[PDB]
């Protein structure tokens, strides 16, 4: 998505979490902006030494390496529950004889 999610000067609208106390669980979403306590000293919502903002921008420029260029990703997960299956395929017809 270099054509869409990059611009001259660098697109910084896209962020990523750089720090976290633990790994995420499957399909866990963490959107917290709590100041990451890297050390033993509580941050009390104050950044500084061993007190970092957990998020950081992507440097998306049109001139960026393919590795560093933006890529749009959609993950499709198929929920199966004890409830009617409502998402089905097209099931194509044939002519009648």
């Amino acid at each position: 998505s270099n054509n869409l999610d990059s611009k001259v000067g660098g697109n910084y609208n896209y962020l990523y979490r750089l720090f976290r106390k633990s790994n995420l669980k499957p399909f866990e979403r963490d959107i917290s902006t709590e100041i990451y306590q890297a050390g033993s000293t509580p941050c009390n919502g104050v950044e500084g030494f061993n007190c970092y903002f957990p998020l950081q921008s992507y440097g998306f420029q049109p001139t960026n390496g393919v590795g560093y260029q933006p890529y749009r990703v959609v993950v499709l997960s198929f929920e199966l529950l004890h409830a009617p299956a409502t998402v089905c395929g097209p099931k194509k017809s044939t002519n009648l004889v």
Partner: nanobody, 127 residues
């Protein structure tokens, strides 16, 4: 696009105080961090202080630390520099600056190229 307008510079005696303001206008929802820089005549530009827009946390260069307070008003879209115990070295043109860039390490803002600059306001410290 944003435009930055400094104000509150001028003459003051060494050991006294001054308050610089900088008003942000344009696409202000895009401000990630703000900074103050200074440049005496004939010497290179120098980082003074930075503030993260969300959180309000401040990073200062060693030369001003404990003398200067950076602060922000999200509502009024303005960054302040409270200069106390003014000295010889403080004399310079002061520039405010804006970046749309989120850096995890607040210290990054000392060295990181900002996106927009004010025209500047002159500070002069009497003998």
């Amino acid at each position: 696009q944003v435009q930055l307008v400094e104000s509150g510079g001028g003459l003051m005696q060494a050991g006294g105080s001054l308050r610089l303001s900088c008003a942000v206008s344009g696409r202000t929802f895009s401000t990630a961090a703000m900074g103050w820089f200074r440049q005496a005549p004939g010497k290179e530009r120098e980082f003074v202080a930075a503030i993260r827009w969300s959180g309000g946390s401040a990073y200062y260069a060693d030369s001003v630390k404990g003398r200067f307070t950076i602060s922000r008003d999200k509502a009024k879209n303005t960054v302040y520099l409270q200069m106390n115990s003014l000295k010889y070295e403080d004399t310079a043109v002061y520039y405010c600056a804006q970046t749309r860039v989120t850096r995890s390490l607040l210290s990054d803002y000392a060295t990181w190229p900002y996106d927009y600059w004010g025209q500047g306001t002159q500070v002069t410290v009497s003998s």
